[PDB]
Structure 1
Amino acid sequence: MDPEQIKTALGSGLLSFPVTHFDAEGRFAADSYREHVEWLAGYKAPVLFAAGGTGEFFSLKPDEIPTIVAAAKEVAGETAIVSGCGYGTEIAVDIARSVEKVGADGILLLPHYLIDAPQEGLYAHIKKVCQSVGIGVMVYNRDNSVLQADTLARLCDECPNLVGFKDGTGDIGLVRQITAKMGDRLMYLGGMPTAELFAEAYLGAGFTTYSSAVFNFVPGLANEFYAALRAGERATCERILVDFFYPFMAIRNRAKGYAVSAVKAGVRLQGFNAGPVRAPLKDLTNEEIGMLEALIGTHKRKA
């Protein structure tokens, strides 16, 4: 689809970021991945982000990314498919063009690698990546890549296919300035780890959707929270925060990287063969897996 079509899809519901399934040896496990993506499709997220952060983009070889995107496309149905992209410009452009070739509907551009960079340099890097493909681009403010509002405005003026903005900073002051400046030029995507913790506040900032990492393993629960959010049903949102998300957060905060590892553990507990995380992430301990299993509780998919 064209960038305006992926833009419309970004504003039509909740965003799904599937974990990437690996076998015991760490290789991509396409059959298990497709089984899980097919199961998630029943819950009708309008956009699927293949090989995003939750999908361990940062541990994939560039040549693996189109294979993962193609696998998702096999079974995702009438769903927009966005690919992760990232690293420095040379690598990012090659990844972008490779996933465009296998039929991705857009790219989510993760930070460049390692260095702190001046705004002018961020502009030049992101412009070059946007101009390398015809599909839609979402930029991702996080870590060592944080666009100021004026820099983002310049990019929007020069790159018509730049259509989305994902925030992973939690900087409420900055993101409100960005939505005030750009208005409906961009779709605004919440991108904090466990984004439901931020979603009610981010409404006021101008964000009405987000990545739901836990949709990987409790999509019914994630969909219900999202529905309550958009309906203004505060007591329902709050009940789900108190009974599910703050307990999940307690597990997540036990170790670095568990924003991904705990989500992948949840997928395994629901009976999908998602396999291990790749180093330098680590998997949950048996004790922690037990905690998560108990938390999932009434939401188990099987016995």
Structure 2
Amino acid sequence: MDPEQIKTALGSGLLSFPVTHFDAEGRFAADSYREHVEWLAGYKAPVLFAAGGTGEFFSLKPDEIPTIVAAAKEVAGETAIVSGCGYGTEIAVDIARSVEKVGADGILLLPHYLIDAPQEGLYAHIKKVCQSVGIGVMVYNRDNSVLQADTLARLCDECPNLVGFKDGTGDIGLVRQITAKMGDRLMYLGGMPTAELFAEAYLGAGFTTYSSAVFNFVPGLANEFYAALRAGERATCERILVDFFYPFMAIRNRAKGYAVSAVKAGVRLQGFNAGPVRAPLKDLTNEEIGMLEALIGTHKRKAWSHPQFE
């Protein structure tokens, strides 16, 4: 679709970022990925971000990315498919073009690699990536790539296909300035690692959607929180925070990278064997997986038959 069409889709509901499934040999496992994506499809997120951060973008070989996007497209139905993109300009442009070729509906541009950069340089980098494709682009303020409002305004003026802004900084002061400056020129996407913890505050900042990483494994719970958020049903949001999210955060905070690793464990627990994380992430221990299983609780989508003899 064209950039205005993906822009519309971004404003039409909750955003899905599926984990990328690997086999025991570490290879992309398309059959498993498709099974999981097809299940998620019944929950009707309007945009699916393949090979995003929750999808371990940062551990994929660039040649894997179009393959993953194409697999998601097979089963995503009437859903917009956005691909992760990133690294320095030369690599990012090659990835962007390769996923445009395989029919992505947009790109989410993760930070360039390693260095701190001046605003003028961020401008030049992001402009070059946006101009390399005709599909829609969402920028992603996080880590070593944080656009100021004036720089983002210049990008918006010179790149019509730049239609979205995702925040991973948690800097309310800055993101409210950005929405004040750009208004409806961009769709504003919450991007903190467990975004429900920020969503009520982010409404005031001007953001009415976000990536729900936990939608990977408790989509019914994530959809309910989202509906409650949009309806102003504070007591419902709060109950779900207290009973699910803060306990999840306690598991997630046990080690670096668990914002991804714990989500992938949840997916496995729900009966999709998404496989291990790639180093340098590490998987949850069997004990920690058990903690997450207990938390999922009434939201389990199956029962397991654990091995036993006599």
**Length-normalised TM-score, structure 1:** 1.00
Counterpart-to-counterpart distance in 2, 1:70 and 1:302: 28
1:39 corresponds to 2:48: no
Deviations 1:59-98 (A, max 9, x none): 0000000000000000000000000000000000000000
Q: Aligned residue for 2:11?
A: 11
SS in structure 1 of the partner of residue 296 of structure 2: helix
Counterpart-to-counterpart distance in 2, 1:54 and 1:43: 18
How much has 1:103 moved relative to structure 2? 0.1
How much has 1:50 moved relative to structure 2? 0.1
Identity %: 100
Counterpart-to-counterpart distance in 1, 2:174 and 2:61: 33
SS in structure 2 of the partner of residue 133 of structure 1: coil
SS in structure 1 of the partner of residue 108 of structure 2: strand
Counterpart-to-counterpart distance in 2, 1:122 and 1:24: 38
* Count of aligned pairs: 303
Deviations 1:15-55 (A, max 9, x none): 00000000011100000000000000000000000000000
Counterpart-to-counterpart distance in 1, 2:262 and 2:24: 18
The runs of at least 4 aligned residues of structure 1 exceeding 6 Å deviation read: none
Counterpart-to-counterpart distance in 1, 2:193 and 2:235: 22
Deviations 1:172-201 (A, max 9, x none): 000000000000000000000100000000
Counterpart-to-counterpart distance in 2, 1:193 and 1:91: 25
Q: Aligned residue for 2:239?
A: 239
Counterpart-to-counterpart distance in 2, 1:294 and 1:273: 18
Counterpart-to-counterpart distance in 2, 1:188 and 1:25: 38
How much has 1:226 moved relative to structure 2? 0.0
Counterpart-to-counterpart distance in 1, 2:287 and 2:170: 31
Counterpart-to-counterpart distance in 1, 2:93 and 2:30: 25
How much has 1:232 moved relative to structure 2? 0.1
Counterpart-to-counterpart distance in 2, 1:93 and 1:239: 44
SS in structure 1 of the partner of residue 126 of structure 2: helix
Counterpart-to-counterpart distance in 1, 2:176 and 2:284: 36
SS in structure 2 of the partner of residue 68 of structure 1: helix
Q: Structure 2 unaligned runs (5+)?
A: 304-310
Counterpart-to-counterpart distance in 1, 2:251 and 2:302: 22
Counterpart-to-counterpart distance in 2, 1:264 and 1:93: 29
Counterpart-to-counterpart distance in 2, 1:202 and 1:261: 25
**Length-normalised TM-score, structure 2:** 0.98
Counterpart-to-counterpart distance in 2, 1:3 and 1:65: 20
How much has 1:273 moved relative to structure 2? 1.1
Q: Aligned residue for 1:268?
A: 268
Q: Aligned residue for 1:52?
A: 52
Q: Aligned residue for 2:72?
A: 72
SS in structure 2 of the partner of residue 114 of structure 1: coil
Counterpart-to-counterpart distance in 1, 2:215 and 2:152: 30
Counterpart-to-counterpart distance in 1, 2:25 and 2:252: 25
SS in structure 1 of the partner of residue 62 of structure 2: coil
How much has 1:171 moved relative to structure 2? 0.2
SS in structure 2 of the partner of residue 188 of structure 1: strand
How much has 1:298 moved relative to structure 2? 0.1
